[PDB]
């Protein structure tokens, strides 16, 4: 059930990467729908948070902390919002787990 | 008073009513007074966290019970056509409350970009 963010942790494929540990990777979105747009995944396959187990809950707080480490990082002073899509309603667009980030402009409401 | 005194600490302490789906030693999940999709709720720590961008590294475990939560209220709503989950930070975020939240949306199909 491999995906493409498989091929990006696996380095098969470019992107352009902000940060790595030894359980994620946070990279530069390649459709960015704003001025900042970031993904951080797990290098672990959720397929989707749905499906997310109980003992991955640090795992996906850990997801939160390096997005906004990275967002200060990246200079996101004035703020972001993270986005978690789930499924067809959710435009869930790649069944691998990822937190959007994106700033770097007004953000409305509804979020979608 | 622990919690705060935003409406959410207050929401905590039950001095000010909301529509509870779910509360346990951590959080509370609760409906949104003014929804943006058919269904739409908030999570929220029972720690008073302003926002995600000043979160500690020990609430790594915290912000991600709000996720798993969230994930397991959605599912008991019957959501399962998915959902969108949503932090906002600061201004440019749209944050509207200086108390950690996330919200839940579903019911509906979201669009892209999400705001
Ligand atoms: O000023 C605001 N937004 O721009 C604002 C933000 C939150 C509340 C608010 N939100 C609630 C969400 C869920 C349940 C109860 C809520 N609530 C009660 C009183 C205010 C308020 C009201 C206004």
Not at 1 to 12: H, V
Not at 15 to 22: L, V
């Amino acid at each position: 059930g491999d995906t493409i963010f498989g091929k990006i942790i696996r380095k098969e494929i470019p992107a352009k990467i902000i940060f790595e540990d030894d359980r994620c990777l946070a990279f530069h979105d390649i459709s960015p729908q704003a001025p900042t747009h970031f993904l951080v995944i797990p290098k672990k396959h959720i397929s989707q948070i749905s499906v997310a187990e109980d003992d991955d809950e640090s795992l996906l707080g850990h997801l939160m902390i390096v997005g906004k480490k990275c967002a200060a990082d990246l200079g996101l002073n004035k703020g972001y919002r993270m986005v978690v899509n789930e499924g067809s309603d959710g435009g869930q667009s790649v069944y691998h787990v990822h937190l959007h980030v994106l700033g770097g402009r007004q953000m409305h409401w509804p979020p979608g």
